[PDB]
Design a protein around this ligand. Structure first.
Ligand SMILES: NC(=O)c1ccc[n+]([C@@H]2O[C@H](COP(=O)([O-])OP(=O)(O)OC[C@H]3O[C@@H](n4cnc5c(N)ncnc54)[C@H](O)[C@@H]3O)[C@@H](O)[C@H]2O)c1
Ligand SMILES: NC(=O)c1ccc[n+]([C@@H]2O[C@H](COP(=O)([O-])OP(=O)(O)OC[C@H]3O[C@@H](n4cnc5c(N)ncnc54)[C@H](O)[C@@H]3O)[C@@H](O)[C@H]2O)c1
Ligand SMILES: NC(=O)c1ccc[n+]([C@@H]2O[C@H](COP(=O)([O-])OP(=O)(O)OC[C@H]3O[C@@H](n4cnc5c(N)ncnc54)[C@H](O)[C@@H]3O)[C@@H](O)[C@H]2O)c1
Ligand SMILES: NC(=O)c1ccc[n+]([C@@H]2O[C@H](COP(=O)([O-])OP(=O)(O)OC[C@H]3O[C@@H](n4cnc5c(N)ncnc54)[C@H](O)[C@@H]3O)[C@@H](O)[C@H]2O)c1
Ligand SMILES: Nc1ncnc2c1ncn2[C@@H]1C[C@H](CO)C(=O)[C@H]1O
Ligand SMILES: Nc1ncnc2c1ncn2[C@@H]1C[C@H](CO)C(=O)[C@H]1O
Ligand SMILES: Nc1ncnc2c1ncn2[C@@H]1C[C@H](CO)C(=O)[C@H]1O
Ligand SMILES: Nc1ncnc2c1ncn2[C@@H]1C[C@H](CO)C(=O)[C@H]1O
Ligand code: NA
Ligand code: NA
Ligand code: NA
Ligand code: NA
Lengths: 430, 429, 430, 429
């Protein structure tokens, strides 16, 4: 009585499959998980509802979970991030996916709702990115919580929410924080954004980066990646920050660190990375250089006051999908990307597949941990063990032709560690 | 006569919006309009243009028109046209014969459409790579005495001009635009530094970080390519024939070796040489699985694409301008744009700001040749340094640069005109 | 009956004082500690034995501890690292310092021994860098342990030893791990080495960096700094690593990662950063390019087999102090810096003062924590609270003209944090 | 006659060990020895050299001697001599008159000691900045007809040569060594990229990261300086008079503004212009406390040091070549080397490898002028590109670079001699 899937055009499946084949060959961590666990099927019995950007890389993740024995139903965690060819390939393979590029808010919620019920029963695992699925179940379907064995969560904003839920006694299911695996936060958030931020800006606007002033709000792992990208192409990068440690890191790297109240007068490009509300406001827009480009890469579209532009501009000219040029009362123009939604996935294709193999190999490990060892994980928010984190990295070395040194027994004795690791104390920051 | 031929005139409104955006990024061209729209220095000029029909080129076209020229236009590559830009130019009433994905026959037909105007044949050439110049000299020599001048955009095209002059076969005066400082040291360098990666990413979405990337040639193009790749975390290996360029690359921290060795290590290959026979069958056979191979030189002569078509066991089209070959050895090769320049073939070419440097030089060269032909005997000439400096100066305001002015005491100390030119003729910047 | 101090030449004091005045003005964190606590004198009653490189920066630290009420007696923790003008200035101010550049191993131990006994009694606090003082007291003077209120420890090797001591039940005094303050490990070890490694190499050898292959063993915080420095000047940098996560970081930054067994055939410059034994051995030396430069920046001189060179070379030619050129049986030459001791302090002046103000402001905070709040700190190894770590960074922002953004009450509510911080969870890696 | 005059002959053994090390880093010079020591092309040459008396220059001196020249030497700066290198040269029996920390009178006396050899006056000039050239022309014109040639090392010196020729006052042929590609694009750029920081660090030990650094000029020197500072985490602000250089700096991500503005923000100031009156009293009065101020241009004319001496309320010598001034406003200024070039005055100048490029050009220019005077009429000349390429090629082996060779088919395609030169005369690299 329900749709078996819902995608833009199932006819795109053959093209999606070609993109998947190429991506598989860039994702050795995921392929290794298939190779190790396809026969034993550790995820047999798992009914995973996933809510995560329905991209080519997410399709390789989905097929890994399926190869490992899971039943899966999927939606995207952003209205603009789905790659319709990837979604079509997943649907063609018989996997229930409810996702397309350019959903409305209503369609978005409907899609998540389709993932909750399997033939054998409701979901018993959650794989989430940003917390929308986690929150939906806790608030709207609390009756389903005792049936769920575990949650794994992809991103900084989502894990922040899990910590908040736990400290408020609202969290009712064990969760693993995948964002804060070393091999996720220090790779995907950093090197991922270093490539895909500029990709979104370029595909949207074709603007020259060299010669511009770029303003990056936040200097966490995402802001660090974005700043490096922009400066690499010859932009002069200004940073805003609230945290004196991150601010001091930026200044030590040669960036001017000042407030948005000042930087708004100088920036030609504005990128928000904070995960926080009220970063770019009407008072900033009114002071910006003509044709300033403004975009957000944080998870939710809460950083930029897009409502201000819609209410106060003389006119809004749509240039092409996800690219709007507003004409203000001061006669100047602002170019706004993706209506303030995360620009790398909304205007380009998100992070390339190789780095997503780090993040998603963590996801598969988390799902195996929660599903097969539920009693290691009481209701709470947990990290994967360092030995598994190290294993994720080690799985990607051969593709890059890296040769890792092995400690001799004498060196391992001297350092007081096992020759097979883990090699760092739990507080190590890399 | 056909007013134009383009893929889809319906793309005109979008094209125009992209032109509006690009105008605001092209202060040199907008300045040429503000200075010369009234006096119309190019009145009576009938310019045939053969140059990648992009948004940037559209802004150049409408600048030439504003300055009084009649213009008829074709692209200098079968894959580089941006159909929305060609539609905007067609809708404006300018004869343009260009679309993305031309056949070789269509390519020549389009150039041929640019030769004849209502009032006579062309009397000015604006060229990129020399196809229009060569076509006239070889096939339409009866039009040569009617042509006042040629201006040439690119390294490969200027090499051809110098060779023609040395052999006594050039018959029309030319200005080498490529070797204006504000072209060669900006467009070829900073332009490729952004548009090479754009082409590779739009085509393949591949991660750059952690890869080995092999860049053949370390000229102005290869310098920009190499910096771009290294910036994203590729380990870049350079090949070179010139010991000076090779020493530059080594002093910037790049491994310099031959393609014969580098083919065994690269995950990404980019040819920047302007030379034939750079990546051959013997190289393809040694490459890592799913090696991405592409060219950014003007002509598609650097990569043996014919070898792949003849020797691969499978050839799968992934999407337009992206082919995945399976070789007898079991490994795969990803070839971009059939070896044609990848930035314009798989993306949008250089962004507008830097093209404003190149194209302001083009406008100046067209004015120089059209209005001061006697300064330019048959031969190959540079624009004066004062004009080259003026191109850079016109772009400083947009970037909020504050230029220092010499005092009279400092100008006297330096033995320099206070208003420039500031460097000797041999200065390399 | 004992020397009041022992330095190379007390006559250098006036020049030392001029260097100190300049350094003070680059060390706003330490000067702020003086300004805040000079009147209340929180360290009144403290008798601090310090064992830490007797440099210009350490002199500003010492005078801060004294201004805060402490009695101090000092030695260097390396035989080659003392700056004789700094030592002379300290001695001239009436502070017992036992340190000079170029001590023998015997003199080194004698110097530490002079710091143990004060007029009023034995030491009751330890400030250490590498653990030599901590170990000396636990092994040779166990009778003094119950009189010691606390230990603060500067460096990675020293903190590793403290963790080992604690897990073996050998640690008898509470300790604070200053190395792993964010504002120490992610600044001093990284940005400090990024400047002072090249300084030591240049002053020793004047070698051109551009065009060379440089091999860096280890890609921790020190190796990251060293690699960046070398590549910035046009060296091609190869990295060795045992930890697959650090190895993957290096490869993602564009370095070749391979083993020393391979890299030894290619390197023109070799820098060891591991903190581990047996990094460069005779088998590597015999394969090195002619005039390969070999140096160590790790704390102890255990990385390079200098004994191999001394036993196997045809001859050793001293070029100048801390620079030796060995002629091997293969006819090639090796240039060895500082006899394998840490090259930044041995051949140049160590880290510049601004970054040392981060490290040493942590040291002063640790000493205040341990001395005035002993019951917060049971026998064990502890970190400073994140709020104090943030304060260290904030203290350095004004000197760099950084403008830090303040959260609004609405943003702080949204992020669920205090407007005054701390701004990050305890696991945050920066 | 005095055999030499140096600070301390006792430093000879150490000097020699430093020379031994530098020889192994200078394959171009060692190659000139291996090729020409037997044939002695410079037999009969009596070369007066005026050039920073460093370890690198010692290797140049002994190369000229190996090639048959007689040489007598002085430094071109009062603070740049390396006394151990001067001692090694003196101990070898070569007349050198140089020490670190000369007075102005001693400086001139030393140059005067180089004019007369046992067999006659000088017949060749090797100059850096033009002091020897100018001294001969103005004070010893009777020696001019006896001088076969001049070779000149540096930008400021070549500017003077061109000005002299334009005014008809140059009377001896000269080779512009600075503008060999392998000099200007290597020494001025990569040399300063390492030796500027060396000078600042040895003098002050200041942290670079987190500072604002102001670099006046973005020529080859300022480009290398700016990269060096940015690499260590300084935020670099550029000043410029030339709109081309200024646009380059902006396209590399540097703020470009005037010294009038930048003096309010910089923590470190470096002058690279070759021009008078760059940092004035009005700038000093606005600077941040403990601003470090230094010059790397040839002559000490860029910084108003006299202003500081006259207007400061206190002047404290921190150590040799380092002065801390206290101004009326309460703030301090740290001045390096009394405004003299800071890399050679406070450190060791450029490392040996890159100097091997510069100095191989010098040897070639001395051979060209001495053995082929008829190729060089009175005027200012470049070395042929084939010789410039040969300089780079001689340094490739040391760095294990593998240079590709064109095939006959590629050379024919490019219209290029298979063995070079590979670039046209106007190529800018
Ligand atoms: N689009 C993507 O592919 C992608 C990838 C990874 C993470 N993310 C998202 O990016 C966002 C940031 O992630 P992160 O890992 O960098 O988190 P982070 O905590 O490491 O960094 C955020 C930084 O913003 C700063 N900040 C907070 N409020 C600010 C304000 N008002 N002004 C200036 N700075 C302020 C904080 O001090 C912090 O350092 C999150 O929403 C995360 O979920 C997106
Ligand atoms: N795609 C674009 O947007 C764009 C932009 C500018 C120029 N171009 C084209 O790019 C090409 C290069 O232009 P350039 O300005 O860099 O020229 P260049 O002459 O500056 O550099 C080319 C380099 O290739 C080297 N080379 C020649 N043959 C080689 C071989 N067999 N192997 C290795 N190296 C070899 C040469 O020594 C030279 O240094 C030309 O075809 C030019 O027209 C393209
Ligand atoms: N000279 C200085 O100014 C200075 C400053 C700070 C720290 N240190 C010292 O530097 C050393 C390193 O400090 P750190 O903070 O970088 O520690 P770290 O733990 O962050 O890094 C050391 C790295 O070496 C790697 N390693 C260990 N054995 C290895 C081997 N056999 N081969 C290759 N890699 C190996 C580890 O995986 C690790 O990543 C320590 O001795 C520390 O005390 C010196
Ligand atoms: N210290 C060294 O080891 C060393 C090495 C090479 C050259 N030099 C000397 O360095 C100086 C610069 O050499 P170069 O090769 O870079 O010359 P250059 O001509 O390439 O660059 C100097 C730049 O200064 C700019 N300039 C001139 N006046 C200015 C002003 N008032 N304000 C701002 N910018 C101004 C010019 O536009 C030019 O771009 C010369 O004196 C040269 O002899 C020193
Ligand atoms: N190609 C991609 N496919 C799927 N997820 C991606 C992609 N690129 C980035 N991400 C997610 C986006 C998210 C913020 O919601 C993160 O933390 C990243 O892991
Ligand atoms: N966007 C663009 N529009 C038009 N021309 C472009 C663009 N980008 C690059 N070029 C040309 C390509 C050509 C080699 O044929 C050159 O030399 C560059 O100037
Ligand atoms: N100038 C300096 N004065 C004092 N200590 C310094 C200096 N530079 C670096 N350090 C210490 C050296 C040590 C390894 O023993 C560390 O961890 C750094 O904090
Ligand atoms: N080590 C060095 N030995 C000798 N000459 C040096 C050194 N470093 C730089 N130079 C000169 C300085 C000069 C400006 O006077 C130049 O143009 C550089 O070639
Ligand atoms: Na992808
Ligand atoms: Na464009
Ligand atoms: Na210091
Ligand atoms: Na030297």
């Amino acid at each position: 009585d329900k749709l078996p899937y819902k995608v833009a055009d199932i006819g795109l499946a053959a093209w999606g499959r070609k993109a998947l084949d190429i991506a598989e060959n860039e994702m050795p961590g995921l392929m290794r998980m298939r190779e190790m666990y396809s026969a034993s099927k550790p995820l047999k019995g798992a009914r995973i509802a996933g809510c995560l950007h329905m991209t080519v890389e997410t399709a390789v993740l989905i097929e890994t979970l399926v190869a490992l024995g899971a039943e899966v139903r999927w939606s995207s965690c952003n209205i603009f991030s789905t790659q319709d060819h990837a979604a079509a390939a997943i649907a063609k393979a018989g996997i229930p996916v409810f996702a397309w590029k350019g959903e409305t808010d209503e369609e978005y919620l409907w899609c998540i709702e389709q993932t909750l019920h399997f033939k054998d029963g409701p979901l018993n695992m959650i794989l989430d990115d940003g917390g929308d699925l986690t929150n939906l179940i806790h608030t709207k379907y609390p009756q389903l919580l005792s049936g769920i064995r575990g949650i794994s969560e992809e991103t900084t904003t989502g894990v922040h929410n899990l910590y908040k839920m736990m400290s408020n006694g609202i969290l009712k299911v064990p969760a693993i924080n995948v964002n804060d695996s070393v091999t996720k936060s220090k790779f995907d958030n950093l090197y991922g954004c270093r490539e895909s931020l500029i990709d979104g800006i370029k595909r949207a606007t074709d603007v020259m980066i060299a010669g511009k002033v770029a303003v990056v709000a936040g200097y966490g792992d995402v802001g660090k990646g974005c700043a490096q990208a922009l400066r690499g192409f010859g932009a002069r990068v200004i940073i805003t920050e609230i945290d004196p440690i991150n601010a001091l890191q930026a200044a030590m790297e040669g960036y001017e660190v000042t407030t948005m109240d000042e930087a708004c007068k100088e920036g030609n490009i504005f990128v928000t990375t904070t995960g926080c509300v009220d970063i770019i406001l009407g008072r900033h827009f009114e002071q910006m250089k003509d044709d300033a480009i403004v975009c957000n890469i944080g998870h939710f579209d809460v950083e930029i006051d897009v409502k201000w532009l819609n209410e106060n501009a003389v006119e809004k000219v749509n240039i092409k999908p996800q690219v709007d040029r507003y004409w203000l009362k001061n006669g100047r123009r602002i170019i706004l990307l993706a209506e303030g939604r995360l620009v790398n996935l909304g205007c380009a294709m998100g992070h390339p597949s190789f780095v997503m193999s780090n993040s998603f190999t963590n996801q598969v490990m988390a799902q195996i941990e929660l599903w097969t060892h539920p009693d290691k994980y009481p209701v709470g928010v947990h990290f994967l063990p360092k030995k598994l984190d190290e294993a994720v990295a080690e799985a990607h070395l051969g593709k890059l032709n890296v040769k890792l040194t092995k400690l001799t027994e004498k060196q391992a004795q001297y350092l007081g560690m096992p020759i097979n690791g883990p090699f760092k104390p739990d507080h190590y920051r890399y």
